[PDB]
Amino acid sequence: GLPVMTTPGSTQFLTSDDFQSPSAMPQFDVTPEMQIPGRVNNLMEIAEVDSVVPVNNTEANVNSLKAYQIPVQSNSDNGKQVFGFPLQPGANGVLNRTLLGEILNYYTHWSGSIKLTFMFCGSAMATGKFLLAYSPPGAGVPKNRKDAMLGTHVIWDVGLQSSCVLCVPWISQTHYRYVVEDEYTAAGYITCWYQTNIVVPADVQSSCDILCFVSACNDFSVRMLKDTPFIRQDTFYQ
Amino acid sequence: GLPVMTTPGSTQFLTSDDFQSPSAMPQFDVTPEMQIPGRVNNLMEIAEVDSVVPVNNTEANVNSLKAYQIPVQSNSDNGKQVFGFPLQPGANGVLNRTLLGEILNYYTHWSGSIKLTFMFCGSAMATGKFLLAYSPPGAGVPKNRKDAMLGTHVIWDVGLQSSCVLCVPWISQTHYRYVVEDEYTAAGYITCWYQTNIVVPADVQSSCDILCFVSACNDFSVRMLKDTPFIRQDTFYQ
Amino acid sequence: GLPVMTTPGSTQFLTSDDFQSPSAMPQFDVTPEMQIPGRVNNLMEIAEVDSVVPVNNTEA
Amino acid sequence: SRSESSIENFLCRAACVYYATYTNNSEKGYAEWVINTRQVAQLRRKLELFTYLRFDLELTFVITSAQQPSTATSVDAPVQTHQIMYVPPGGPVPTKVTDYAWQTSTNPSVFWTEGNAPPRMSIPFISIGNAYSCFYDGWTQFSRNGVYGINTLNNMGTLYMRHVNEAGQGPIKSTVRIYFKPKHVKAWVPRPPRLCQYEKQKNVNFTPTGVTTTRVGITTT
Amino acid sequence: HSRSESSIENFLCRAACVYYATYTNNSEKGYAEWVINTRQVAQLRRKLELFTYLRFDLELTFVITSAQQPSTATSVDAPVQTHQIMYVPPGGPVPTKVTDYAWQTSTNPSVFWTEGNAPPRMSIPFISIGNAYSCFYDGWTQFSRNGVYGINTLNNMGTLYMRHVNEAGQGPIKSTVRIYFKPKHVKAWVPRPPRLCQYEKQKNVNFTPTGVTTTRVGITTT
Amino acid sequence: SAQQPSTATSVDAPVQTHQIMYVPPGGPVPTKVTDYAWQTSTNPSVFWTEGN
Amino acid sequence: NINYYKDAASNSANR
Amino acid sequence: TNINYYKDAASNSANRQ
Amino acid sequence: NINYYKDAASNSANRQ
Amino acid sequence: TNINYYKDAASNSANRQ
Amino acid sequence: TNINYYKDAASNSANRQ
Amino acid sequence: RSITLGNSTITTQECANVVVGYGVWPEYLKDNEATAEDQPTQPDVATCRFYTLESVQWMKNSAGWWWKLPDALSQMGLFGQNMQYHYLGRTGYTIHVQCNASKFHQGCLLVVCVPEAEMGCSNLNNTPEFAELSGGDTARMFTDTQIGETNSKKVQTAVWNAGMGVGVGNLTIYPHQWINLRTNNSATIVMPYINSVPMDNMFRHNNLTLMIIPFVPLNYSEGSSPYVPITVTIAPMCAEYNGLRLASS
Ligand SMILES: CCCCCCCCCCCCCC(=O)O
């Protein structure tokens, strides 16, 4: 009879506990292992994979592939916004259902840079230049190309490189940011503008599309495991 | 099945217990540490900090900065005690709300010497001399400068020393004293008297003020943690 | 989850038991000791001292 | 660090997979459940993030009982004890509260009395293949007919539940909640997360939903 | 001699009731919820507020006690009652009813505890986004210097839900959960004056001015 | 503990828990069963459930 | 870290 | 004698010394 | 002997 | 684990290795 | 592998080995 | 002697002693403690220099004054310009409160620098207004009496509680000096960056609040000059700005 004193926490079933339990099938010969391709070890391995972004969240496009298409055209003006969304990877609809956003919604905090890859799916004869800009928070969304130019930006020639990567850095007051929207963990605004109008030849369509892809960089991590809001249940499925 | 015998105290939640508990967030990567200025390691680090003493607790002055002002004036007399409070750092109203007294009110026992710093805020032309005396208990509060002069006393000449620090020593029958009032653990009386009247020239004010500061010396300690009587609640604040 | 089996006598308060218990006042700095004269270590030290005997227990 | 985003930490948290009820009244007062992981939404989606998995399990049972209405005077019920029996595919099946199968000469079973720590029980990787299959793009019959889906692979046996004590003058209804906790996990072939809400436990059947939540214009910030 | 008991660890590392709430047996929506802040109670708040920035792990102790409520049935027999405490980190799904899917806690940590046993306890790490917990915040939530002013622009710690896992008892039972915080491994910075005026609201410093100290008659009074 | 006489029907009493608080000389003192002092932020106290 | 059970399934998580 | 049983540092007792 | 608690007051009596 | 708490061999665990 | 936990010999197990 | 920084060289010096915050001299953010991955802008001379704010008058009735620090230099020169153009900022300060009277004057000021001076309201069910808490180059004043409850969005400026519900006589815990006109002419406090995060936005968060509270009131006999001003001169030190973009107040 070893003297013992029970401490608080006894008789407790903590969902996130890590205790050993006696096995119900002792000496069960598990079927040997096989080297199956594509072993995942971390969810960031998934978060680092490019996935198409529905920048055109318009109600009519959301139920179609049109959501992923960013329209571009040869226009008569100069410095017309192509698109703009806030830097809410886990909250805004543009990113919340991306691969990255889906993973983020299982966690509470996030930190790291983001790769936005833009691919010009127009004719081989089309040319043009665009301004891809990341404006940190504090100043409103850039209203004109002049405003966007004062922040982190990139000049993308579609003729030279049909694909272009904009790497949004981690510029934050804190080490992490809330996956959910908080004006404290503000993140910024991402805008695209015409740098030089889409010039096209004769007998070529002047209206083309661009595709947006999101991935996480090498300096990206998530914290505080939690449940996703995306899945909901009313009665046991059968 | 290792034989075991639970002793009294099992299934017990003692507020001041120090057992290990299972983590609810396993493998949480804490946000790193930062070298923030002003590290506190002990509450005596705070108790050692000078804070202004409201020696003039008078009903009308207590709701104004006038409480911290010790009136001094040019006089026709001598002796003429300027102030006197008992040496109850944690009980009497003069000291219990000081920095030192606030800390002492979270403990039951105290022991050590006390720094009483007196700063003269009169005109640069005023001069004078005061007797700062600590009279241990056993005899009533010193009634005249003659009586106060027998106990520990200090002659402070205002003119060479704008400020003067009196280190009230620890003269007690016991190793410690009660923070709360008890005639057993008596501390004494601290009085001040005119040693030589405040002499002032023409066309400058003859009435000046003094500020009093309380801190702990290098040999001061507190014991038996407890709740403070100062904070009170009747409902959950919202 | 270490396997354990509770033996008879658990959750028992024996007046004359000698177990360790968790302190309610952690890190309490006790007042130092003083060499007070006449320390007793055993009650036989008292029993060995001569004391007057009431041999004349007469009621009065 | 990405510590908490490892697959072990992602999946190694207890999750209620199913709960059923049984009563002290009648002789059919036993409960039963065919073991699948697709009746519940949360854990199912977490696992469906991957195509093939392999892991051990920590099973924790949360059993709660409740007094049911009665017309008798003074219902003083003693502590309630329960039996949880596992019938692997092919074993005998309890048909009544008082069947011989409950002898569990071989079938593992837990006997647990109310008011103590929930019973817990670990189980190894009990699959026939070299990994659990989360999806199956095939049939059960070689004729490309019969059954289509993961319900051709799922064959993990049944779980029966009963009161060990005998009823008195007042009925007692109890609810067992089974909790799965994958330990020592290995995953392969990740796949897009579930978008449309689940409709059936035995197949992928979905009703189409939109890609994302909507805003007005591409500039809507 | 030693100042041991006056270390910050000893000062703050004692359990303290930060909040307590109630829920009912069958009821209809008989679940409880609490947005986690440390400013609803006076004692713990003052101890923490003696410093501007803090950093520590937490020991959570739950004291859950139930009581029979009046009923009309003859001799109601209480079976042992089990409770579930679920933590919903900010952004997670929220229980809308006693029988919600959120209670499945596939990911959200939660405790299942049966009455009559040792109080459940859980340690939790330093959950802050910054390099220290902030006791005070002299700023706003919006960059337009508008919206909210104070520490409630920082406080985002998620919600804490409480329910009976047992249910349907022929007689009603009301339960009271009491949450207890105990800072472990504490680090404090920038001490500040103790609170003088009584606390008024949990979401701001707002106070009603009070005098500096208690009063005496004369400066020589003893 | 002991059941005291009562007038209503079907006393189905759940488990009883008790608190023992130590108020050192000078600390706030409970004036009611539901006082703020019972928080025992500093004052040592034990919470114990009957039957253990 | 010492394991008390003969079966690998009885072990704690691989952390 | 003080041995820590849990894999997470937050689970440890206070730094009383 | 082996002591489980950090404070000497928690130790058993000095009978040996 | 390599232990046995009881003085009689019948008290020991099964020979499952 | 049995040790004695109590300070008095009367607390020990029986003389079975 | 003198203290020369960035084209500005205040000389107020007489042996004396500069109170260096919490024992920490301001320094630039270390690569070990940073998270903002973009390279900062360090204007140095152009920003780290002595900006002298508006002067205030010390009166026989004055209760005290306060300034919020980022929003005190918010409009002053290139410090303010970088502040407007950047999302994140980090600075220490050298604060120099200058007051001079004559030998025939008397009085004493407490000059303290409160980090995180969150202030309360008179109407307890709301928070004070931005303009009530803040005064650009315009010291806001404490009051001699409790302000009214009816006031919807005003700051409880009763000095004896410092607008923070605390004991004004205990403000000495924050880095401070005394300007005793008997023996003193100025006060100099070198404050380091005080915050829970390595960098923060400079409009949304006033990391520090300077408070000048006369503990012994000004007095003087008839004839001695009656207008005694107090002049505040603050100099950013080791200023860093991150996240360049558009600007807005
Ligand atoms: C929660 C624990 C609180 C216990 C505090 C009780 C302290 C009383 C000590 C008894 C002193 C005995 C003095 C004597 O009679 O010689």
Residue numbers in the entry:
A (entry chain a), B (entry chain G): 1 to 238
C (entry chain C): 1 to 60
D (entry chain Y): 43 to 263
E (entry chain E): 42 to 263
F (entry chain A): 107 to 158
G (entry chain b): 29 to 43
H (entry chain H), J (entry chain j), K (entry chain 4): 28 to 44
I (entry chain D): 29 to 44
Article excerpt on this structure:
Coxsackie B viruses (CVBs) belong to the Enterovirus (EV) B species of the Picornaviridae family and are divided into six serotypes (CVB1-CVB6). The structural proteins VP1-VP4 form protomers, and five of these protomers assemble into a pentamer. Finally, an icosahedral capsid, approximately 30 nm in diameter, consists of 12 pentamers. VP1, VP2, and VP3 are exposed on the particle surface, whereas VP4 is an internal protein.
The immunodominant PALXAXETG motif, located in the VP1 N-terminus, is a highly conserved region in enteroviruses that elicits non-neutralizing antibody responses. On the basis of studies reporting the most immunoreactive parts of the PALXAXETG motif, we excluded the 15 amino acid-long region SESIPALTAAETGHT from the VP1 N-terminus of CVB1 and designated the deletion PALXA. Using this modified construct, we produced a VLP denoted VLPΔpalxa. SDS‒PAGE and total protein staining of the capsid proteins confirmed the presence of proteins of approximately 38 kDa, 29.5 kDa and 26 kDa corresponding to the expected molecular sizes of VP0, VP1 devoid of 15 amino acids from the N-terminus, and VP3, respectively. The results of the quality analyses and structural determination revealed that the 15 amino acid deletion from VLPΔpalxa did not prevent particle formation. The melting temperature (Tm) of VLPΔpalxa was 69.05 °C ± 0.05, which is comparable to that of unmodified VLP (Tm 69.78 °C ± 0.09), indicating that the modification did not compromise the thermostability of the particles. Notably, the yield of VLPΔpalxa was 29.5 mg/l, which was 2.5 times higher than the yield of the previously produced unmodified VLP, indicating that the particle stability may have increased compared with that of the unmodified VLP. We successfully engineered CVB1-VLPs lacking the conserved PALXAXETG motif without compromising particle formation or structural integrity, as confirmed by high-resolution structural analysis. As expected, the VLPΔpalxa-vaccinated group was negative for antibodies recognizing this epitope, whereas only the formalin-inactivated virus group elicited a significant response toward this peptide, with a GMT of 1089 (p = 0.004). To summarize, we demonstrated that targeted structural modification of the CVB1-VLP capsid can reduce immunodominant antibody responses, especially those directed against the conserved PALXAXETG motif after vaccination.
